[PDB]
Amino acid sequence: AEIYNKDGNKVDLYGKAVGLHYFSKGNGENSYGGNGDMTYARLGFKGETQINSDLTGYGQWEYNFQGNNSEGADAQTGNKTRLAFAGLKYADVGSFDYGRNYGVVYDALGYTDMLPEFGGDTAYSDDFFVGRVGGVATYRNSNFFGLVDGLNFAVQYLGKNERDTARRSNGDGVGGSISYEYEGFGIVGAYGAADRTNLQEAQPLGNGKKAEQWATGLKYDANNIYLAANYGETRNATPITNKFTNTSGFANKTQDVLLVAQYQFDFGLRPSIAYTKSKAKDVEGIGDVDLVNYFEVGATYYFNKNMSTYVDYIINQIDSDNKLGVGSDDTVAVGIVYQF
Amino acid sequence: AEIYNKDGNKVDLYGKAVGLHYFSKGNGENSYGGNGDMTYARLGFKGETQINSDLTGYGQWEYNFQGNNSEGADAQTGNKTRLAFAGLKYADVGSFDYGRNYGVVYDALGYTDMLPEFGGDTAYSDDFFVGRVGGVATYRNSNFFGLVDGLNFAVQYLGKNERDTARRSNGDGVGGSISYEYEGFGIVGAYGAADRTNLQEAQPLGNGKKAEQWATGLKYDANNIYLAANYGETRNATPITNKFTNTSGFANKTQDVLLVAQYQFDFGLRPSIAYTKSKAKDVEGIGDVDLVNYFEVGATYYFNKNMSTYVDYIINQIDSDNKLGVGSDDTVAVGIVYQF
Amino acid sequence: AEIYNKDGNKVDLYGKAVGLHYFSKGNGENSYGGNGDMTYARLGFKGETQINSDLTGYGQWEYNFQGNNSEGADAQTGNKTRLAFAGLKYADVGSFDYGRNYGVVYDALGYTDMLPEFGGDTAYSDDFFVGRVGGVATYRNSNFFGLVDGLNFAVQYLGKNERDTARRSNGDGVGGSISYEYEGFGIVGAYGAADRTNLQEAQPLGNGKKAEQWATGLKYDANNIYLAANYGETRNATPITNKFTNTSGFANKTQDVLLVAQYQFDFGLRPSIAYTKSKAKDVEGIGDVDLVNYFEVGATYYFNKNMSTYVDYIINQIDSDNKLGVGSDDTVAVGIVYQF
């Protein structure tokens, strides 16, 4: 809820407070979700300030404090900055902006990502055009420039990023996406591509110079029915591992699915049903491994706009068998969740 | 300040600004406080949303950014999360909530924590049940389901928390507290007990399958006079070191008292007097030591609901010839502090 | 924006969202600024309770989150608290604070510190009196005790400060500043000094017992016309490297000049001309070398008070022979800034 609003400005402070606990055989260290205390928080700020009838200045910055760390050594673990950027909206010319934000592929993935906690597997962090990424930028368009209603696209070039490290960096890119909601129904596509950096293709798991995430989906957000599914392949991006040869970096080829359905019940029950299989094909000396397979089952409960709590659980589809090592065990998290 | 209060979910964004500096002898390291700059700040938010008549939902977070650090290598010593939790309160059934909050036995330990900077020595953090600790479920209740004004309770489970460090872990616990307030007068005590996990156990100092901390407090609040002292012992919970042999871990046995007399003047002076004795028994090969011995003189002065400042002072009863080597040296704090 | 206000207490929640990019020849390592993504944000707060007519308590804080980071290894990088302090004002007795705050000398440097992005090259941090230190005790006075208009002074005692980084330390100082602004024009000096900690004497570079930076500046800020120029030197003060030999520490002797002039057109463009020359003297064996040289050209384009953006261009007057290693290159900066 917006908490300053003078002068044709409005700074919205927003955040949450999540008591989360995971549950899985032992430390889980090898079920799909893990296990133990998983409690975090959110504190960020949406700002906007039209500089007049058609133009809009704005920025936003959402950080992440973790609630599970001691008050010593490691109090800084998994503290990050999720989003941060500047922008301008200008009539039906459209919008633009730059800083760390959601690659554009996300535009797709989004549809299937709403489990109460888990799901959203396809889309990693810093995976190039599919996650939240460091300096990228975007143009978004508003019903073909206002000409025809509901169909907005965008497009995005993704800056040089030779960070520390393997699964973190990324050479360059264009990328975009076109998209269309028809009262209730809705259909989306998105694709992108970019240089990898030599730290990359010099990893042991990796044959590419240039890779592509593309991805699509049909959703039906209406009347408390939500139906959404995605299919989406990749090329030299999903990042993988081999706790066995313990080696790392990237999976040449992969296919992706996601299914999800939720019904938003009458007093705020809103259980949820979900599917989801990410196979890598052609892993060097592995043939084919499922980086992730599960049905899901669970629900959020909406005390209102501010509170909820949920129970969410993952019936796990890989098994011990599994070529690279994705832990096999189910994991079920329960958590509670205030938010202003 | 409460900065946002709406559709029945208020949010109070809160903190301070704390110009602090210790003075100890020559160099302090062999004092009980430190020496030089201590300055720090405080950001955090409680919010509570009214689901409705007898259902309030609230959350809360509180971080703390040290101010004494440089803007390079280190500007990170000290920041931590202090607090993140979440939950609900039901007219007369009690509460509940979960995350990183206080273990029960502070309900009692607290009373004696009221010195303007020091005092409150027995409540380490991540000490199981006595300081803030992570992953705790905290059921409270009040006036015995509304039945007996002033008579309060609580129970709580303490998570399996395998961090890396010895001094910072904790197998699992229950524990709680009973408390009763009568026209100035406060009676409390509480008690808990949890496994150590093997890594705790495998410390040179440290003998037991089982830790238990407990404690009690009797006090007088009211009429511009604070009167309160505290007593409690420990089973294998109180962390200690041996700077001589750089030996680390815990103390089979301790016994502690806290003693505060304080008084709030018509013009916003409020001096504050203090004892603080924490003896260890059975530290392997040392036998008995005093972890903490002091009287503390010092006072606070309250420009108003927003400002304050003060000078707190510890008269060290430890001495040089102390078997673990607790610092013998008097230490003297001087604080000024805004705070919304 | 000020978000809160009743009862003497006003608080002011404030920040921005700076989306940045550097452009510098090829790999940026030999430029003045770097090159790539740079997108950071600010979060902070000013607070001030009037405890009466004459007396005022404030506190305030300011932290610098970065956005050029993944959300993994490094999420923590180049992040600080810059400012944290508090204290009291008094009709014309004056004023006072402790915490981490700007040093006296800045008060003159603060006049040339204006480039949309670069400039102010002389005010390192954690450099004794020239930028932000931590543990400083500042006294300010207004309109010479209300007596004399625009004449204000201020002495600052500067903390024992022995950190890790050689070049983040400092023994103790005092210092100040008379500042005199007369209808249109502004003319001010500051100086101070103090000891160096030993890890400081120790570096191969810099011969000193005792440091001192002074500086003055002059300006005409009035009418959509800003010119300032600054000049000043330092004893065993400005922090310098020898990328060749890789050695560290301090420039025996340095000399420093700042030249800015910008103009404020009334649809809101406001172009800036910039120049800056810093030169070490007597650097142990390297003797006379160049610490920063360039002419700068760029402009800021306000949308309103709350938005804006700018480009800043460093035309770099160093060259490749440069005894110390100073990159010789130009850099350019695009920026889009929102701020509330």
mmCIF file with all atom_site columns, N, CA and C in Angstrom, chain B residues 213-247:
data_model
loop_
_atom_site.group_PDB
_atom_site.id
_atom_site.type_symbol
_atom_site.label_atom_id
_atom_site.label_alt_id
_atom_site.label_comp_id
_atom_site.label_asym_id
_atom_site.label_entity_id
_atom_site.label_seq_id
_atom_site.pdbx_PDB_ins_code
_atom_site.Cartn_x
_atom_site.Cartn_y
_atom_site.Cartn_z
_atom_site.occupancy
_atom_site.B_iso_or_equiv
_atom_site.pdbx_formal_charge
_atom_site.auth_seq_id
_atom_site.auth_comp_id
_atom_site.auth_asym_id
_atom_site.auth_atom_id
_atom_site.pdbx_PDB_model_num
ATOM 1   N N  . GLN B 1 213 ? 18.176 -24.453 30.092 1.00 0.00 ? 213 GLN B N  1
ATOM 2   C CA . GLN B 1 213 ? 18.363 -23.144 30.584 1.00 0.00 ? 213 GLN B CA 1
ATOM 3   C C  . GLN B 1 213 ? 17.109 -22.804 31.274 1.00 0.00 ? 213 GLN B C  1
ATOM 4   N N  . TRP B 1 214 ? 17.212 -22.085 32.382 1.00 0.00 ? 214 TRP B N  1
ATOM 5   C CA . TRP B 1 214 ? 16.015 -21.570 33.058 1.00 0.00 ? 214 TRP B CA 1
ATOM 6   C C  . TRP B 1 214 ? 16.319 -20.421 33.997 1.00 0.00 ? 214 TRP B C  1
ATOM 7   N N  . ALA B 1 215 ? 15.266 -19.869 34.529 1.00 0.00 ? 215 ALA B N  1
ATOM 8   C CA . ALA B 1 215 ? 15.472 -18.591 35.034 1.00 0.00 ? 215 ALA B CA 1
ATOM 9   C C  . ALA B 1 215 ? 14.135 -18.029 35.470 1.00 0.00 ? 215 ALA B C  1
ATOM 10  N N  . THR B 1 216 ? 14.208 -16.933 36.248 1.00 0.00 ? 216 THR B N  1
ATOM 11  C CA . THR B 1 216 ? 13.059 -16.334 36.924 1.00 0.00 ? 216 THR B CA 1
ATOM 12  C C  . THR B 1 216 ? 13.323 -14.888 37.301 1.00 0.00 ? 216 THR B C  1
ATOM 13  N N  . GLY B 1 217 ? 12.238 -14.131 37.429 1.00 0.00 ? 217 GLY B N  1
ATOM 14  C CA . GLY B 1 217 ? 12.336 -12.693 37.691 1.00 0.00 ? 217 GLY B CA 1
ATOM 15  C C  . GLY B 1 217 ? 11.263 -11.994 38.528 1.00 0.00 ? 217 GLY B C  1
ATOM 16  N N  . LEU B 1 218 ? 11.721 -11.244 39.511 1.00 0.00 ? 218 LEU B N  1
ATOM 17  C CA . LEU B 1 218 ? 10.783 -10.519 40.317 1.00 0.00 ? 218 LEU B CA 1
ATOM 18  C C  . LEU B 1 218 ? 11.063 -9.015  40.355 1.00 0.00 ? 218 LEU B C  1
ATOM 19  N N  . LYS B 1 219 ? 9.986  -8.272  40.210 1.00 0.00 ? 219 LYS B N  1
ATOM 20  C CA . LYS B 1 219 ? 10.154 -6.917  39.820 1.00 0.00 ? 219 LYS B CA 1
ATOM 21  C C  . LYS B 1 219 ? 8.994  -6.029  40.142 1.00 0.00 ? 219 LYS B C  1
ATOM 22  N N  . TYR B 1 220 ? 9.381  -4.755  40.182 1.00 0.00 ? 220 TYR B N  1
ATOM 23  C CA . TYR B 1 220 ? 8.514  -3.627  40.469 1.00 0.00 ? 220 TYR B CA 1
ATOM 24  C C  . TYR B 1 220 ? 8.668  -2.503  39.420 1.00 0.00 ? 220 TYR B C  1
ATOM 25  N N  . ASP B 1 221 ? 7.613  -2.349  38.626 1.00 0.00 ? 221 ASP B N  1
ATOM 26  C CA . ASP B 1 221 ? 7.535  -1.328  37.614 1.00 0.00 ? 221 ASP B CA 1
ATOM 27  C C  . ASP B 1 221 ? 6.359  -0.460  38.017 1.00 0.00 ? 221 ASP B C  1
ATOM 28  N N  . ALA B 1 222 ? 6.579  0.849   38.060 1.00 0.00 ? 222 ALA B N  1
ATOM 29  C CA . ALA B 1 222 ? 5.499  1.782   38.311 1.00 0.00 ? 222 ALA B CA 1
ATOM 30  C C  . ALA B 1 222 ? 5.934  2.891   39.245 1.00 0.00 ? 222 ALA B C  1
ATOM 31  N N  . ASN B 1 223 ? 5.250  4.027   39.126 1.00 0.00 ? 223 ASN B N  1
ATOM 32  C CA . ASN B 1 223 ? 5.463  5.168   40.016 1.00 0.00 ? 223 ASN B CA 1
ATOM 33  C C  . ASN B 1 223 ? 6.810  5.887   39.764 1.00 0.00 ? 223 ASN B C  1
ATOM 34  N N  . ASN B 1 224 ? 7.312  5.689   38.547 1.00 0.00 ? 224 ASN B N  1
ATOM 35  C CA . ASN B 1 224 ? 8.595  6.250   38.131 1.00 0.00 ? 224 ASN B CA 1
ATOM 36  C C  . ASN B 1 224 ? 9.739  5.575   38.871 1.00 0.00 ? 224 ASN B C  1
ATOM 37  N N  . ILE B 1 225 ? 9.574  4.281   39.158 1.00 0.00 ? 225 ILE B N  1
ATOM 38  C CA . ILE B 1 225 ? 10.628 3.476   39.788 1.00 0.00 ? 225 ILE B CA 1
ATOM 39  C C  . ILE B 1 225 ? 10.721 2.057   39.179 1.00 0.00 ? 225 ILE B C  1
ATOM 40  N N  . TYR B 1 226 ? 11.889 1.684   38.648 1.00 0.00 ? 226 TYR B N  1
ATOM 41  C CA . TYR B 1 226 ? 12.044 0.323   38.156 1.00 0.00 ? 226 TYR B CA 1
ATOM 42  C C  . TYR B 1 226 ? 12.795 -0.524  39.182 1.00 0.00 ? 226 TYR B C  1
ATOM 43  N N  . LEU B 1 227 ? 12.199 -1.669  39.545 1.00 0.00 ? 227 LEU B N  1
ATOM 44  C CA . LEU B 1 227 ? 12.804 -2.609  40.498 1.00 0.00 ? 227 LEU B CA 1
ATOM 45  C C  . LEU B 1 227 ? 12.660 -4.071  40.110 1.00 0.00 ? 227 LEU B C  1
ATOM 46  N N  . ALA B 1 228 ? 13.780 -4.733  39.899 1.00 0.00 ? 228 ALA B N  1
ATOM 47  C CA . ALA B 1 228 ? 13.719 -5.944  39.155 1.00 0.00 ? 228 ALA B CA 1
ATOM 48  C C  . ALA B 1 228 ? 15.021 -6.653  39.331 1.00 0.00 ? 228 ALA B C  1
ATOM 49  N N  . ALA B 1 229 ? 14.992 -7.889  39.827 1.00 0.00 ? 229 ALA B N  1
ATOM 50  C CA . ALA B 1 229 ? 16.149 -8.765  39.584 1.00 0.00 ? 229 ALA B CA 1
ATOM 51  C C  . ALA B 1 229 ? 15.849 -10.214 39.206 1.00 0.00 ? 229 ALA B C  1
ATOM 52  N N  . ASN B 1 230 ? 16.912 -10.888 38.772 1.00 0.00 ? 230 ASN B N  1
ATOM 53  C CA . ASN B 1 230 ? 16.834 -12.155 38.044 1.00 0.00 ? 230 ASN B CA 1
ATOM 54  C C  . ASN B 1 230 ? 17.789 -13.310 38.409 1.00 0.00 ? 230 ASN B C  1
ATOM 55  N N  . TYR B 1 231 ? 17.293 -14.535 38.316 1.00 0.00 ? 231 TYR B N  1
ATOM 56  C CA . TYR B 1 231 ? 18.169 -15.604 38.678 1.00 0.00 ? 231 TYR B CA 1
ATOM 57  C C  . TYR B 1 231 ? 17.836 -16.807 37.874 1.00 0.00 ? 231 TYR B C  1
ATOM 58  N N  . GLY B 1 232 ? 18.881 -17.486 37.409 1.00 0.00 ? 232 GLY B N  1
ATOM 59  C CA . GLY B 1 232 ? 18.717 -18.657 36.556 1.00 0.00 ? 232 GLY B CA 1
ATOM 60  C C  . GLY B 1 232 ? 20.043 -19.366 36.344 1.00 0.00 ? 232 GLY B C  1
ATOM 61  N N  . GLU B 1 233 ? 19.916 -20.674 36.086 1.00 0.00 ? 233 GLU B N  1
ATOM 62  C CA . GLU B 1 233 ? 21.078 -21.505 35.862 1.00 0.00 ? 233 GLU B CA 1
ATOM 63  C C  . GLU B 1 233 ? 21.043 -22.154 34.513 1.00 0.00 ? 233 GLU B C  1
ATOM 64  N N  . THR B 1 234 ? 22.132 -22.860 34.218 1.00 0.00 ? 234 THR B N  1
ATOM 65  C CA . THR B 1 234 ? 22.259 -23.480 32.918 1.00 0.00 ? 234 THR B CA 1
ATOM 66  C C  . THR B 1 234 ? 22.791 -24.879 32.919 1.00 0.00 ? 234 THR B C  1
ATOM 67  N N  . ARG B 1 235 ? 22.112 -25.659 32.077 1.00 0.00 ? 235 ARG B N  1
ATOM 68  C CA . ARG B 1 235 ? 22.606 -26.930 31.651 1.00 0.00 ? 235 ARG B CA 1
ATOM 69  C C  . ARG B 1 235 ? 23.143 -26.846 30.241 1.00 0.00 ? 235 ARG B C  1
ATOM 70  N N  . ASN B 1 236 ? 24.448 -26.680 30.196 1.00 0.00 ? 236 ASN B N  1
ATOM 71  C CA . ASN B 1 236 ? 25.177 -26.961 29.006 1.00 0.00 ? 236 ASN B CA 1
ATOM 72  C C  . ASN B 1 236 ? 24.641 -26.088 27.903 1.00 0.00 ? 236 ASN B C  1
ATOM 73  N N  . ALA B 1 237 ? 24.312 -24.840 28.229 1.00 0.00 ? 237 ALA B N  1
ATOM 74  C CA . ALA B 1 237 ? 23.806 -23.938 27.209 1.00 0.00 ? 237 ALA B CA 1
ATOM 75  C C  . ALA B 1 237 ? 24.645 -22.698 26.997 1.00 0.00 ? 237 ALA B C  1
ATOM 76  N N  . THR B 1 238 ? 25.077 -22.076 28.084 1.00 0.00 ? 238 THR B N  1
ATOM 77  C CA . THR B 1 238 ? 25.898 -20.849 28.022 1.00 0.00 ? 238 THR B CA 1
ATOM 78  C C  . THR B 1 238 ? 27.254 -20.924 27.282 1.00 0.00 ? 238 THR B C  1
ATOM 79  N N  . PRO B 1 239 ? 27.343 -20.408 26.050 1.00 0.00 ? 239 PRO B N  1
ATOM 80  C CA . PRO B 1 239 ? 28.624 -20.545 25.355 1.00 0.00 ? 239 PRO B CA 1
ATOM 81  C C  . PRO B 1 239 ? 29.773 -19.858 26.107 1.00 0.00 ? 239 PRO B C  1
ATOM 82  N N  . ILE B 1 240 ? 31.005 -20.413 26.086 1.00 0.00 ? 240 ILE B N  1
ATOM 83  C CA . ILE B 1 240 ? 32.236 -19.796 26.692 1.00 0.00 ? 240 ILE B CA 1
ATOM 84  C C  . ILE B 1 240 ? 33.512 -20.102 25.888 1.00 0.00 ? 240 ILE B C  1
ATOM 85  N N  . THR B 1 241 ? 34.571 -19.320 26.107 1.00 0.00 ? 241 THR B N  1
ATOM 86  C CA . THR B 1 241 ? 35.915 -19.643 25.546 1.00 0.00 ? 241 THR B CA 1
ATOM 87  C C  . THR B 1 241 ? 37.069 -19.671 26.547 1.00 0.00 ? 241 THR B C  1
ATOM 88  N N  . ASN B 1 242 ? 38.232 -20.045 26.060 1.00 0.00 ? 242 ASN B N  1
ATOM 89  C CA . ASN B 1 242 ? 39.339 -20.180 26.954 1.00 0.00 ? 242 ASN B CA 1
ATOM 90  C C  . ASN B 1 242 ? 40.552 -19.377 26.475 1.00 0.00 ? 242 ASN B C  1
ATOM 91  N N  . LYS B 1 243 ? 40.362 -18.125 26.005 1.00 0.00 ? 243 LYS B N  1
ATOM 92  C CA . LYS B 1 243 ? 41.383 -17.487 25.117 1.00 0.00 ? 243 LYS B CA 1
ATOM 93  C C  . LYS B 1 243 ? 42.787 -18.020 25.306 1.00 0.00 ? 243 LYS B C  1
ATOM 94  N N  . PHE B 1 244 ? 43.079 -18.681 26.441 1.00 0.00 ? 244 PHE B N  1
ATOM 95  C CA . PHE B 1 244 ? 44.446 -19.204 26.700 1.00 0.00 ? 244 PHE B CA 1
ATOM 96  C C  . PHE B 1 244 ? 44.740 -20.347 25.785 1.00 0.00 ? 244 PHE B C  1
ATOM 97  N N  . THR B 1 245 ? 43.900 -21.347 25.804 1.00 0.00 ? 245 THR B N  1
ATOM 98  C CA . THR B 1 245 ? 44.170 -22.436 24.906 1.00 0.00 ? 245 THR B CA 1
ATOM 99  C C  . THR B 1 245 ? 43.280 -22.395 23.608 1.00 0.00 ? 245 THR B C  1
ATOM 100 N N  . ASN B 1 246 ? 42.597 -21.276 23.455 1.00 0.00 ? 246 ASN B N  1
ATOM 101 C CA . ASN B 1 246 ? 41.813 -21.046 22.287 1.00 0.00 ? 246 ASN B CA 1
ATOM 102 C C  . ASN B 1 246 ? 40.853 -22.146 22.100 1.00 0.00 ? 246 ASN B C  1
ATOM 103 N N  . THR B 1 247 ? 40.577 -22.758 23.219 1.00 0.00 ? 247 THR B N  1
ATOM 104 C CA . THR B 1 247 ? 39.539 -23.732 23.446 1.00 0.00 ? 247 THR B CA 1
ATOM 105 C C  . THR B 1 247 ? 38.090 -23.190 23.544 1.00 0.00 ? 247 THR B C  1
#
